[PDB]
């Protein structure tokens, strides 16, 4: 045994609840996972969780640095988040500089891939984009296609889709697959007509990314052009709020509800394979009941972010346990981090695996339109990251 | 009436003298201006300068942070640098957060142009790229040109040439001129033939940016394709290094020297319109002297960066004087910065005018070949930022 520990963690997420991973939403996950870890660590150990606002931007680098200064030079033992690409950069870098471990269910951009230096203390629990591109690459090697057009949106602020398709690119690039790139700003004036024109100009297979509503518009504009008959193959990445199917992702209670249903017939959606388990149920229930008595409703099943942070917590308490046993202390940041890499464990929803680079393996699903008359949408296939194998559902 | 002041200055530049703005090459300039200034401010006032290696990267962020956090929570009174684009962003952000005034002869990219918030405390004493672009935009209106190609090297690291042409692009895209982009890594293998061929596809007016040698390469190949001589109008920006915009640019004591002179008959160079005066001569003598006394092989003299930081100090001092008159203190960076904005003062080389946005107005000149036989390259015309008039010479 050893004396009771006193772990200080700095959580950095956006207070703004308009984000799938805001504090209000992630906190419940952390606390839960924290109540389960106790009773791996010396009896009596405690956790002092500071929830600061990231504003999904600079603020994080600010709050982190001010604390470290006010505290007269003392830094936290664990840093969770940020999740936003631009915000997770400096914090990550500084964490590496200070030998502080940083775990995050965000920071999915392909740049955090190179952890030989800059991002050496970063461990990613959610599937990076590159992973999703490893899948598309596989999916592509299946239909035997070799060319593709990447059509995405770019707000020059958060650029979620820019980074998203960047993964498809980084991967398709290495393998040689040819790629046509077309970007546009949805927020600003939409000239969808152009999009479609270039599409019907470049390739016959298209991989898109933009707000669900923007994808609809593009699907219609192209439908009216009779491109939705079987000459083209449309795809759109929707990894976090993919649940509209089973009800109809085209349906909107809108008048265009019919054209939409038609066009979407040629539209396949790639999302995350979210497995369940009794545990996960109880977790989901409790996390839901909290966010709710807070003024927010939840998307039925907790999102991948909430699940990830829960598992993040464990993964840390799992590595601090091994580091301790060997003799070192919590202050040996890199040591801890190295423990969190290249391993497999039981998360709140099932198996979880972090590759030898500190990036979690991902599992994705593809949704298509099984019965056109009705507009029935169902997963036609799964792909398994670690395994490295794709497969059509029964 | 006032007590002796002790300004704590934090200079952030590269230790490596490969940069036209290394600490060793800039320190003298700073000290010189310091003497002249320490003899405006209260008697007994003393400057404490801290020269720290920016490393043109994250180092600059780390140093600043480690300095402040370590020794209390006391930040410096004035930060000088960094110059490098990527390394100035954080330091500038952290400075605008701590209400600290930040002056630099770099950070010329178009992003630091938005100061309604994150760069509120940044003043640029050297001509930004967007001004250099406003220059081109006038040259283009002059010749009735409305289209252009932007060919540049993109190392995906420091990326100076990319930021350079980004300025031209920002200005053109707004005014309506159409452009065609084209990037290549010059760190890798140069497919100079493809480049030249795409050029043959695009526009007749070509804006270029790359290593002095690379512009020459392309020039030979284009020449080989007969694209030189009247057909296309090549351009290339060389704003700082005198060894590059100096007459005989095409020479290399190489076998191609004849051919090169032949190609450059169509290549026009864009650089800064540096002025001089008696006092500047004294300055250059000492700066030259100090640099050599440090072993550093005298480049040629003082670059825009050196002359820039010298006038940077006079600018800070002029502003302190005034702010220290309205009943404010050295710790009110904001009040100090707004004082350095929208004004004109005497630098070592002459007039210096900062616009109402914290950006130094820039005056440019164009270098063309006036005798194909000889190889003579004299200045054809100039542009004056503030006035905004481009004028051809006799």
């Amino acid at each position: 045994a050893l004396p009771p520990q006193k772990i200080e963690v700095l959580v950095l997420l956006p207070q703004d609840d308009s984000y799938l991973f805001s504090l209000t939403r992630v906190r419940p996950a952390i606390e839960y996972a924290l109540r389960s870890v106790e009773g791996l660590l010396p009896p009596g150990t405690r956790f002092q969780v500071a929830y600061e606002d990231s504003d999904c931007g600079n603020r994080a680098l600010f709050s982190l640095v001010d604390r470290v200064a006010a505290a007269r030079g003392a830094k936290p033992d664990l840093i969770l988040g940020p999740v936003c690409e631009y915000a997770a950069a400096p914090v990550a870098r500084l964490a590496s500089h200070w030998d502080l471990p940083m775990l995050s269910a965000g920071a999915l951009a392909a740049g955090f891939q190179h952890k030989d230096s800059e991002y050496s203390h970063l461990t990613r629990v959610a599937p990076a984009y590159a992973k999703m591109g490893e899948m598309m690459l596989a999916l592509f090697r299946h239909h035997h296609w070799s060319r593709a057009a990447l059509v995405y949106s770019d707000d020059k602020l958060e650029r979620n889709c820019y980074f998203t398709l960047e993964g498809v690119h980084e991967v398709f690039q290495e393998e040689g697959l040819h790629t046509s790139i077309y970007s546009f700003d949805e927020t600003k004036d939409l000239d969808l007509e152009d999009i479609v024109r270039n599409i019907q100009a470049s390739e016959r297979v298209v991989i898109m990314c933009a707000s669900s509503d923007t994808i609809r518009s593009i699907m219609l504009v192209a439908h009216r052009h009779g491109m939705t008959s079987g000459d083209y193959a449309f795809f759109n990445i929707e990894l976090f709020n993919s649940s509209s199917y089973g009800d109809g992702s085209w349906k909107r209670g809108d008048k265009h509800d019919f054209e939409a249903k038609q066009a979407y017939s040629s539209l396949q959606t790639v999302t995350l394979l979210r497995t369940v388990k009794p545990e996960f149920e109880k977790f989901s229930m409790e996390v839901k009941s909290s966010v709710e008595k807070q003024g927010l409703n939840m998307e039925d099943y907790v999102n991948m972010f909430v699940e990830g942070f829960h598992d993040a917590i464990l993964l840390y308490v799992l590595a601090l346990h091994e580091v301790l046993r060997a003799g070192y202390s919590k202050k040996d940041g890199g040591k801890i981090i190295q423990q969190t890499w290249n391993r497999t464990f039981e998360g709140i929803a099932g198996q979880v695996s972090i590759d030898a680079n500190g990036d979690r393996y991902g599992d994705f699903s593809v949704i298509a339109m099984t019965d056109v008359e009705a507009g029935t949408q169902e997963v036609i296939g799964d792909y398994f990251g670690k395994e490295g194998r794709f497969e059509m559902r029964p | 009436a006032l007590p002796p002041q002790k300004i704590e200055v934090l200079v952030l530049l590269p230790q490596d003298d490969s940069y036209l703005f290394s600490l060793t090459r800039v320190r003298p300039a700073i000290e010189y201006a310091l003497r002249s200034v320490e003899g405006l401010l209260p008697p007994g006032t003393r400057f404490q300068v801290a020269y720290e290696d920016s490393d043109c990267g994250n180092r600059a962020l780390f140093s600043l942070v480690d300095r402040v956090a370590a020794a209390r929570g006391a930040k410096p009174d004035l930060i000088l640098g960094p110059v490098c684009e990527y390394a100035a962003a954080p330091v500038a952000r952290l400075a605008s957060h701590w209400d600290l005034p930040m002056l630099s002869a770099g950070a010329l990219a178009a992003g630091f142009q938005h100061k309604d918030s994150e760069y509120s405390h940044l003043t640029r004493v050297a001509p930004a790229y967007a001004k250099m672009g406003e220059m081109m935009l006038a040259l283009f209106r002059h010749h009735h040109w409305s289209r252009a190609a932007l060919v540049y090297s993109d190392d995906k690291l420091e990326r100076n040439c990319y930021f350079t042409l980004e300025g031209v692009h920002e200005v053109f895209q707004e005014e309506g001129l159409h452009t065609s982009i084209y990037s290549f890594d010059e760190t890798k293998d140069l497919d100079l033939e493809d480049i030249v061929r795409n050029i043959q596809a695009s526009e007749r007016v070509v804006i270029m940016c790359a290593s002095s040698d690379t512009i020459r390469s392309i020039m030979l190949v284009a020449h080989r394709h007969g694209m030189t001589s009247g057909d296309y109008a090549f351009f290339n920006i060389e704003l700082f290094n005198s060894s590059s915009y100096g007459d005989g640019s095409w020479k290399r004591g190489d076998k191609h020297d004849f051919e090169a002179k032949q190609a450059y008959s169509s290549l026009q160079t864009v650089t800064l319109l540096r002025t001089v005066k008696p006092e500047f001569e004294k300055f250059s003598m000492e700066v030259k002297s100090s640099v050599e006394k440090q072993g550093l092989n005298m480049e040629d003299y003082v670059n825009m960066f050196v002359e820039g930081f010298h006038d940077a100090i006079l600018l800070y001092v002029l502003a302190l004087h005034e702010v220290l008159r309205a009943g404010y203190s050295k710790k009110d960076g904001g009040k100090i910065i707004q004082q350095t904005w929208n004004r004109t003062f005497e630098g070592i080389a002459g007039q210096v005018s900062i616009d109402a946005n914290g950006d130094r107005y820039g005056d440019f000149s164009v270098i063309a070949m006036t005798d194909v036989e000889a190889g003579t390259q004299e200045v054809i015309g100039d542009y004056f930022g503030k006035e905004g008039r481009f004028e051809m010479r006799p």
Binding site: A87, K156, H169 | E85, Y86, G111, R159, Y162, D185
Partner: peptide, 21 residues
Amino acid sequence: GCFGRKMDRISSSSGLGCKVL
């Protein structure tokens, strides 16, 4: 295309212009 061989400095500021070969 608009991605270049890499994007090393992802998460810095550079987001005012694309790339392409």
